[PDB]
Each structure stands twice: as structure tokens, then as C-alpha cells.
Amino acid sequence: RTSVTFHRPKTLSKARDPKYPRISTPGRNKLDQYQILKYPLTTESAMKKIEDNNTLVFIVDLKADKKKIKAAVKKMYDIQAKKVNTLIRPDGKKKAYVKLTPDYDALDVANKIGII
Amino acid sequence: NPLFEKRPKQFGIGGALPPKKDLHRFVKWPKVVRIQRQRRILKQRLKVPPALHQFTRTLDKNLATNLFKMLLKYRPEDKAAKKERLLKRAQAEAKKPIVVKYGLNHVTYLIEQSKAQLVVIAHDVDPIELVVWLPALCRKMEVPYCIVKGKSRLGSIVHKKTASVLCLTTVKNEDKLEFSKILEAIKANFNDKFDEVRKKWGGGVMGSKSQAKTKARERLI
Amino acid sequence: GRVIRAQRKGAGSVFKSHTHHRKGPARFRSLDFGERNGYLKGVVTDVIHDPGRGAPLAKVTFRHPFRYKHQKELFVAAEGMYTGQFVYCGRRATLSVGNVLPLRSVPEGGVICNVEHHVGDRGVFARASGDYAIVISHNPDNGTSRIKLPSGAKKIVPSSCRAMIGQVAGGGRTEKPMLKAGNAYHKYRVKRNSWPKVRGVAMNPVEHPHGGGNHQHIGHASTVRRDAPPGQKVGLIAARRTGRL
RNA sequence: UCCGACUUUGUGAAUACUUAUUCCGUGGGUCGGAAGUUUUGGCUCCAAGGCCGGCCGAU
RNA sequence: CGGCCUGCCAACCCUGGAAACGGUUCAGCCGGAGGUAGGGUCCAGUGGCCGGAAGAGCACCGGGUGUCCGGUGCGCCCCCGGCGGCCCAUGAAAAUCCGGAGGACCGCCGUUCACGCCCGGUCGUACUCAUAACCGCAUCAGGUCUC
RNA sequence: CUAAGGGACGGGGUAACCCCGGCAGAUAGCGCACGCGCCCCGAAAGGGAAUCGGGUUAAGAUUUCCCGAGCC
Ligand SMILES: [K+]
Ligand SMILES: [K+]
Ligand SMILES: [K+]
Ligand SMILES: [K+]
Ligand SMILES: [K+]
Ligand SMILES: [K+]
Ligand SMILES: [K+]
Ligand SMILES: [Mg+2]
Ligand SMILES: [Mg+2]
Ligand SMILES: [Mg+2]
Ligand SMILES: [Mg+2]
Ligand SMILES: [Mg+2]
Ligand SMILES: [Mg+2]
Ligand SMILES: [Mg+2]
Ligand SMILES: [Mg+2]
Ligand SMILES: [Mg+2]
Ligand SMILES: [Mg+2]
Ligand SMILES: [Mg+2]
Ligand SMILES: [Mg+2]
Ligand SMILES: [Mg+2]
Ligand SMILES: [Mg+2]
Numbered sequence: 097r098t099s100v101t102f103h104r105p106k107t108l109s110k111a112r113d114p115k116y117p118r119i120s121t122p123g124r125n126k127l128d129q130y131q132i133l134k135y136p137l138t139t140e141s142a143m144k145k146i147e148d149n150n151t152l153v154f155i156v157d158l159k160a161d162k163k164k165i166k167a168a169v170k171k172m173y174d175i176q177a178k179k180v181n182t183l184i185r186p187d188g189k190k191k192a193y194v195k196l197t198p199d200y201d202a203l204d205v206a207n208k209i210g211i212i
Numbered sequence: 213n214p215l216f217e218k219r220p221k222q223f224g225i226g227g228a229l230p231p232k233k234d235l236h237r238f239v240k241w242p243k244v245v246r247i248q249r250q251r252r253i254l255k256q257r258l259k260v261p262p263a264l265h266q267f268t269r270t271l272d273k274n275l276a277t278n279l280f281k282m283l284l285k286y287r288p289e290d291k292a293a294k295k296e297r298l299l300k301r302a303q304a305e306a307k308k309p310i311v312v313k314y315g316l317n318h319v320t321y322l323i324e325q326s327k328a329q330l331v332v333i334a335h336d337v338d339p340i341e342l343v344v345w346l347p348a349l350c351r352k353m354e355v356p357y358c359i360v361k362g363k364s365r366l367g368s369i370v371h372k373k374t375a376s377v378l379c380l381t382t383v384k385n386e387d388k389l390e391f392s393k394i395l396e397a398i399k400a401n402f403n404d405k406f407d408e409v410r411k412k413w414g415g416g417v418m419g420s421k422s423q424a425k426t427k428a429r430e431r432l433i
Numbered sequence: 434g435r436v437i438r439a440q441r442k443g444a445g446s447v448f449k450s451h452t453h454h455r456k457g458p459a460r461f462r463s464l465d466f467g468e469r470n471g472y473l474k475g476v477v478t479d480v481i482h483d484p485g486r487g488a489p490l491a492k493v494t495f496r497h498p499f500r501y502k503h504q505k506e507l508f509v510a511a512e513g514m515y516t517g518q519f520v521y522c523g524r525r526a527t528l529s530v531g532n533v534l535p536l537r538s539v540p541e542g543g544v545i546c547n548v549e550h551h552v553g554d555r556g557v558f559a560r561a562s563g564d565y566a567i568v569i570s571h572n573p574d575n576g577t578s579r580i581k582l583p584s585g586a587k588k589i590v591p592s593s594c595r596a597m598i599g600q601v602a603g604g605g606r607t608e609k610p611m612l613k614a615g616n617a618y619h620k621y622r623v624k625r626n627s628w629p630k631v632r633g634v635a636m637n638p639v640e641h642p643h644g645g646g647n648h649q650h651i652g653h654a655s656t657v658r659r660d661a662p663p664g665q666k667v668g669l670i671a672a673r674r675t676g677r678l
Numbered sequence: 679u680c681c682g683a684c685u686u687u688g689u690g691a692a693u694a695c696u697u698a699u700u701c702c703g704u705g706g707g708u709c710g711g712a713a714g715u716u717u718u719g720g721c722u723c724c725a726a727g728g729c730c731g732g733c734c735g736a737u
Numbered sequence: 738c739g740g741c742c743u744g745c746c747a748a749c750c751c752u753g754g755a756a757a758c759g760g761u762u763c764a765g766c767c768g769g770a771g772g773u774a775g776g777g778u779c780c781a782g783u784g785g786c787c788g789g790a791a792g793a794g795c796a797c798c799g800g801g802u803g804u805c806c807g808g809u810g811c812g813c814c815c816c817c818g819g820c821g822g823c824c825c826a827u828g829a830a831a832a833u834c835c836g837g838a839g840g841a842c843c844g845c846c847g848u849u850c851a852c853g854c855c856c857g858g859u860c861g862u863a864c865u866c867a868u869a870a871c872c873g874c875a876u877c878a879g880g881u882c883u884c
Numbered sequence: 885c886u887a888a889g890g891g892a893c894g895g896g897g898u899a900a901c902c903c904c905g906g907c908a909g910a911u912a913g914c915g916c917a918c919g920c921g922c923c924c925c926g927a928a929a930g931g932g933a934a935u936c937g938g939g940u941u942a943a944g945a946u947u948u949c950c951c952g953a954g955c956c
Contacts, residue, residue: 225471226715501723
């Protein structure tokens with residue numbers, strides 16, 4: 097005992113291997129792409145962003161962060177987002193500014209969706 | 213090789229830093245270790261009444277190893293052996309066994325019934341009031357008894373832990389002479405001395421430092 | 434009535450000491466084997482000011498006796514100590530100002546400061562600026578020593594108690610007139626909430642035993658029993674005499 | 679708050695003891711018995727060496 | 738933001754050796770514990786030139802022209818530097834970052850270098866800040882911290 | 885991130901609500917088997933990774949959008 101100080105010794109601890117699962121339902125992704133992308137904005141200010149900055153405006157879930165948004169637009173419309181700017185509006189909803197990469201034309205995407 | 217050389221270090225008060233030492237006696241132990249060590253010291257310092265001090269006198273090592281090697285002959289059957297004996301009887305569809313008796317209530321009953329031929333008492337029954345009266349009862353009933361070290365040793369014989377008392381009522385005819393020689397030695401101690409034993413207190417031993425500093429004061433006279 | 438000001442200080446609410454800019458407790462290094470049997474050299478690195486303390490403190494660095502580490506100490510500085518000076522602590526330390534010695538090693542008449550009351554106390558006596566204790570006599574049978582405290586009282590201490598050689602630095606501080614309420618305000622700003630004292634005769638009876646009256650006067654003897662309850666024990670407490678001799 | 683009784687509260691000599699209790703110190707770091715570093719404001723740890731993982735060096 | 742230059746006031750280095758003392762500030766003060774002098778190192782800048790960058794912005798003329806040269810200061814605001822004074826007053830801490838002492842260990846393996854590749858979450862962000870967006874029952878001569 | 889300060893494991897008190905943090909309790913872990921070992925909250929004026937110029941709206945951006953140029 098070269099130390100005059102006693103320390104608690106290191107003891108083995110096993111991991112949890114339960115005899116039954118506490119949850120048996122698999123657990124389903126309730127924040128899927130349809131919850132993330134609710135609907136696009138069609139205001140006059142929102143329509144200007146389409147042809148001026150290659151940008152689509154969406155109303156998004158409050159629980160959706162920027163990473164889920166760009167993954168959602170890719171799985172919904174097969175387009176690539178260059179960047180996503182988000183805000184929470186004074187009405188309490190979340191609004192996303194989705195700028196598409198060059199070689200994606202938001203006006204063509206806007207025509208396919210139906211907002212134009 | 214001339215390159216090799218000694219590089220001694222002088223370990224003074226303001227000298228080289230000392231190497232790792234044992235430092236065992238200066239270790240600050242957990243509270244559980246400190247309480248059990250102080251409990252041993254307190255029992256040494258406090259005057260121990262004779263009825264408790266008598267458990268300090270234990271069976272001799274030579275006698276104890278003789279008695280236990282004989283107590284091993286009369287071990288009760290283990291759980292598997294009892295199961296096997298049940299099956300063997302069931303195949304026919306026995307004999308009176310000679311085994312050690314144990315359990316404080318059962319041993320106490322045998323002694324008052326005058327059937328105990330030898331009583332073995334453990335020296336470390338933690339509630340000491342369980343067996344503190346036992347040497348008096350065995351001596352009153354004229355029963356040879358001894359105090360041996362280890363309740364866990366007594367427990368091992370009966371396939372338990374901490375038997376705390378063992379009783380022999382019967383011995384085999386192959387062991388009558390050996391059991392009798394054992395019996396007289398256990399009677400010479402523990403039974404014929406019980407009367408003189410009932411007056412010895414023996415519990416006032418001080419610490420080594422306290423002893424050394426009284427010897428000096430005694431030598432200064 | 435209401436709780437008097439003397440009683441309210443024990444709650445320690447606004448009467449706690451002002452210690453936000455203090456440099457740490459000033460005291461000897463913990464007694465150990467090297468000090469008990471030999472000497473240990475440290476070097477003074479700084480002489481610093483401690484708010485609320487009249488005496489300067491000395492920062493001293495030792496080498497740890499068994500760990501590869503530095504050991505930094507801070508105690509009250511004796512007068513004459515200086516930076517870059519070697520100080521020695523222990524049984525075999527030389528009788529020089531700034532050294533820390535057991536009382537057994539200090540002859541009769543020596544001037545000492547920061548004197549321990551119990552062995553390993555790290556210094557309890559004669560710590561204020563300009564103060565010191567005097568070694569009066571030694572008893573080898575009981576292993577005790579007699580010292581004279583700054584108040585004049587004789588005291589019996591174990592001969593193994595440690596003291597620093599010399600007197601505390603910063604003496605003469607209270608000979609200078611303060612001259613100003615503002616100088617007193619700054620002095621107590623770094624000590625405690627105590628300075629501006631209102632006379633008890635200037636109060637109402639609800640606040641003080643001296644309060645009230647159509648003239649400012651105590652109206653009863655200002656000497657008070659030693660066993661008076663708090664709130665009643667004001668004025669001169671358990672005084673054997675009064676007046677100016 | 680002072681003061682007395684009981685309790686905590688024990689042991690042995692013609693006042694002593696120490697383990698209860700109380701207080702102080704330490705990162706519980708050289709305690710008891712025996713045997714055999716004053717240097718100048720510098721650095722100092724994790725052993726060289728010897729002998730068979732082991733012992734001395736480090737009673 | 739990047740490169741080169743410059744290099745204040747202090748601080749530091751090398752040579753040398755000072756009374757008939759000298760150097761020096763508005764004030765101080767400094768020198769055989771090495772001054773004056775000579776020659777250098779570093780430090781900071783919100784300093785200079787180039788890149789950025791004239792392609793911008795601005796002012797004119799109907800695409801075009803120009804965007805230049807000096808002077809001054811007990812001036813005002815901000816920041817910095819370096820001295821002096823004052824205290825029975827001596828005027829936070831931690832995260833974070835950098836440097837160093839040592840050298841166990843290690844060779845086709847080391848590399849705090851340049852260039853090159855990818856990524857960067859959540860919440861706030863409008864407006865008033867007051868003789869009308871705050872409190873005083875009000876669109877109240879009051880009150881309410883700043884640049 | 886820490887400041888004055890606040891809460892709080894164990895322990896102590898308390899009929900319980902609750903009141904006490906230095907009273908030290910095997911302190912619950914950290915590097916490379918081996919080695920070491922003296923909780924959180926609390927500042928949009930304290931400390932602190934890194935951005936600039938120009939343009940743009942009815943309403944934004946006194947550095948978030950656009951252009952260009954950097955940085956961590
Ligand atoms: K009251
Ligand atoms: K006050
Ligand atoms: K007064
Ligand atoms: K009065
Ligand atoms: K904004
Ligand atoms: K108003
Ligand atoms: K902050
Ligand atoms: Mg945002
Ligand atoms: Mg009045
Ligand atoms: Mg009154
Ligand atoms: Mg020059
Ligand atoms: Mg340019
Ligand atoms: Mg132009
Ligand atoms: Mg201004
Ligand atoms: Mg190195
Ligand atoms: Mg923290
Ligand atoms: Mg605090
Ligand atoms: Mg609790
Ligand atoms: Mg915080
Ligand atoms: Mg800040
Ligand atoms: Mg605006």
C-alpha cells in the first residue's frame with residue numbers, strides 16, 4: 097500500500113440483458129418526410145425567391161432541424177438543397193428557405209409541385 | 213565496461229526524494245475497517261468477566277486436529293447423498309445412523325436429556341449470549357465439552373456455515389478406544405477446571421506504546 | 434422592543450466579514466517529519482499586502498519532502514524579511530529572524546511571533562502588525578514553556594510549539610491620526626459592516642436600553658452583569674472598575 | 679444563563695491509568711522499542727549499482 | 738483579410754570605459770550594478786505601399802469624364818504609450834490559449850510546413866424604447882440604464 | 885467559464901413539512917494490464933473561436949438575403 101490514501105477498488109459490472117423487452121412495439125418514425133414538409137408558401141414574397149434566388153419556401157414541423165429538411169426535400173422532390181435557412185414565424189409555425197444547388201431550377205420544381 | 217557507473221542517492225531530510233515505501237500502517241482505511249479494528253482493541257482494554265473470558269481458552273491444536281479428523285467420520289449426509297438414499301429405499305419398495313448432532317436448540321435439548329457424550333462449542337458466536345451459558349450447563353449436567361476455534365469450521369462438518377455447536381451422542385465400536393482417549397483430555401481441561409475458571413477475569417491488556425512507557429516509569433524507580 | 438444591533442450581528446447577514454480580495458489564510462506549513470527532526474529551506478518570493486490586515490504577508494516556496502512538486506506557503510511576515518531570502522523551518526533551524534523554530538530551541542528572552550498554542554496549530558499568537566511574544570522560561574520536566582503575550586498575560590505552551598523569530602512587520606500603524614471619517618470608511622470597507630456607530634442614547638427605547646428620554650442620558654448604570662441576556666448586555670460588561678485612573 | 683443531583687461512567691493505588699467522551703492536525707507520509715540538506719532568488723520524480731522474477735541499495 | 742516596408746515611447750544586445758562629472762523631462766530621473774557615444778535586436782500601429790480595387794461607390798456630361806495636391810493645432814471624441822502621484826483603501830476568478838524543464842520510447846518513419854478535400858446543430862432577430870408602443874387606472878407636463 | 889451567491893449526494897437534526905456543506909464518507913473517476921487520484925446552477929454590461937465592403941424590400945439584413953472577398 098504505497099499510498100496512505102484508500103481508493104475504492106475497480107469492480108466488474110455487467111451490461112443489461114433483460115429477460116423480456118420493456119417495449120415490444122418497433123417504434124415508427126412519426127417525424128417522416130410528410131410531417132417535415134407540410135406545404136410550400138405561395139405568398140408574393142415567397143414566389144419572388146423562386147426566380148431570384150432558386151429558393152423554395154416551405155412550412156415545416158417545429159421539431160425538424162436543418163439536416164432533416166434537406167434530407168426531406170431530397171426524398172420528396174429528388175432535388176439537392178445548397179443550404180437551408182429556417183425561422184419561427186410570429187404565428188408559431190416554422191418556415192424554411194431552401195436554396196437549390198445550381199443545375200436545379202426552382203421554377204421547374206415549382207411547376208411540378210403545382211404552386212405556379 | 214567503463215561507461216557503467218554507480219549513481220548513489222543520499223536520502224536525507226533535504227536530500228533525494230525517497231523511493232516508494234510500504235506505508236501500510238499509516239493507511240487511512242474505510243470506516244468499516246476502522247470500526248472492526250477498534251472493536252478488537254476495546255475488547256482487549258476492557259475488563260472481561262470470567263463467563264466471557266473462558267471462551268479465550270480454546271482446545272489445543274493437537275487435540276483439535278484429532279477431534280476434527282474424528283468428527284469428519286460422522287458427518288451428516290449431503291443433499292445428493294440423502295437423495296440417493298431415498299432412491300435406494302424406493303427401489304426395494306434401513307439402519308440407525310451415527311452422525312454428529314448440531315443446532316443450538318437440538319444440542320441444548322440433548323444435554324438436558326443426558327444424551328450428549330461430547331459438546332463442541334464455537335468460540336466466535338457473534339451474539340455471545342447464545343452460548344455464554346453453555347459451558348455452565350454442560351458442567352452442571354456432567355457432560356464433557358470443549359471450546360474450539362471457528363464456527364465456520366463447525367459449519368463445514370455439517371454442510372452448513374457457522375454451526376456454532378456440535379454434539380456427539382453415539383460413537384462407533386471401531387472408535388470406542390479413540391473416542392475415550394479424546395474424552396479424557398477434554399475432561400481434564402474445560403470441566404475439572406471450570407470451578408477455578410469461574411474466577412479469572414483477564415481483560416486489561418494495554419497497548420504496546422502504553423506498555424513501553426510504563427516499563428520506563430517502572431525502571432525510573 | 435425590537436432586536437438590538439448587537440444581537441443582529443450573530444445572524445451574519447450583512448455583518449459577515451469582507452473577504453473577496455484576501456490572499457488566503459496566513460499560517461505555518463503543516464508540521465511533518467522534516468520539521469519535527471531537522472530543517473527545511475524555503476525561499477521568499479513576494480512580500481504582499483493583504484486587505485484588512487495591517488501586517489504584510491510573505492510568499493514562500495518549499496520543495497515537497499517526498500513528492501516531485503513545489504510547495505507554496507504564506508504566513509505573516511516578520512520585520513526584516515525580504516524577497517530572495519532563505520528561510521528555514523524545523524528543529525535544527527538557526528535562531529535568525531524569519532526562521533520557524535520549536536520553542537524548545539529558542540532561549541530565554543527571545544522575540545517570537547505567530548506562536549502555536551497546540552503542536553501543529555500553524556500559529557495562533559502574536560499575529561497582528563508590530564506584535565510579538567517573549568520567551569520567559571523553560572520547564573524540561575513537563576516539557577512546557579512560558580511566554581508573554583502582547584496583552585501582558587503569561588501563557589504556558591508545549592515546548593514543541595512553533596514560532597517565527599522576530600516581531601511582526603508593519604509596526605507603528607496606529608500612531609498616525611486618521612483625521613477623516615473617509616479614512617475610517619476605507620479602513621472598515623475591507624473588514625466588516627461596523628464603522629459608523631450610532632450611540633445608544635441617540636436611539637428610541639424600542640431599539641436600545643439607552644434609548645429614550647427628554648435628554649440624552651442612560652438613566653441607569655452602564656455597568657452590566659456578566660450573565661445578562663442578549664439584548665440587555667450593553668454598555669460596560671462585567672467591569673471591575675470604571676473611570677480614568 | 680449559572681449552580682447541584684442522577685445518567686453518559688470505566689479501571690487501580692495509598693492519586694495514577696486509558697479504551698468511553700471531548701478537542702486539534704494530516705492528500706491519516708517515518709509513531710513506539712531496539713540496533714547501527716545553512717548553500718549564491720539554479721535543477722532535484724519514474725535508481726544507478728551489486729548479488730541470486732527475487733534480495734540489498736532503502737536496518 | 739494577405740505580403741513587403743517602417744519601426745514611435747519603453748525594454749534588450751555588442752564595443753568601450755566616464756570628475757573639469759556628464760546625459761536628460763513640462764515634471765521626473767539615469768550612470769563603474771557600466772553613462773554619454775557608436776552600432777544593432779525586439780515591441781505596436783486605428784502607420785506607408787501593393788494585392789482586395791475600381792470592375793465598387795460618389796459627383797457631373799450625354800455610353801464618356803473625374804475621383805488630385807498641400808498646410809495647420811494647449812482644438813473636440815476614441816484608443817494606445819510612457820512617466821508621476823495616492824492609500825491604516827493596494828483595487829476578481831475560472832474556462833481557454835501559448836511557452837518551457839525533462840527525455841523514458843522510437844527509424845523508412847517523423848513532420849506545429851504549403852497546397853488540396855468534406856462538414857458546420859438548436860433558440861432569439863419585426864417594431865417602440867418614450868411629452869403616444871414601458872410603469873404611473875389614460876395617447877398623464879411625473880418616473881425609467883446607455884452609445 | 886467562473887463572481888457575490890444558490891441548490892444539493894452521504895452524514896447530522898427534525899413527528900413530519902423541512903433545516904444544515906465541511907462535517908470527510910470505499911467520492912462514484914482520469915492516462916496509456918500499468919500508472920495517477922489533494923456535483924450542478926449563477927452575468928444578452930465581467931472573461932470569451934472566427935467577417936468584411938458594396939447591393940437589395942411595402943415592411944429585413946444598423947454584419948442573417950444577393951455579389952464579391954476572407955476567416956474559425
Ligand atoms: K422582539
Ligand atoms: K455601515
Ligand atoms: K456615534
Ligand atoms: K435613556
Ligand atoms: K434583426
Ligand atoms: K410618455
Ligand atoms: K456573457
Ligand atoms: Mg436562426
Ligand atoms: Mg430621536
Ligand atoms: Mg428596552
Ligand atoms: Mg547609442
Ligand atoms: Mg488596391
Ligand atoms: Mg467608377
Ligand atoms: Mg463622448
Ligand atoms: Mg526539450
Ligand atoms: Mg462548470
Ligand atoms: Mg462561490
Ligand atoms: Mg438530507
Ligand atoms: Mg453557467
Ligand atoms: Mg460579455
Ligand atoms: Mg429595419
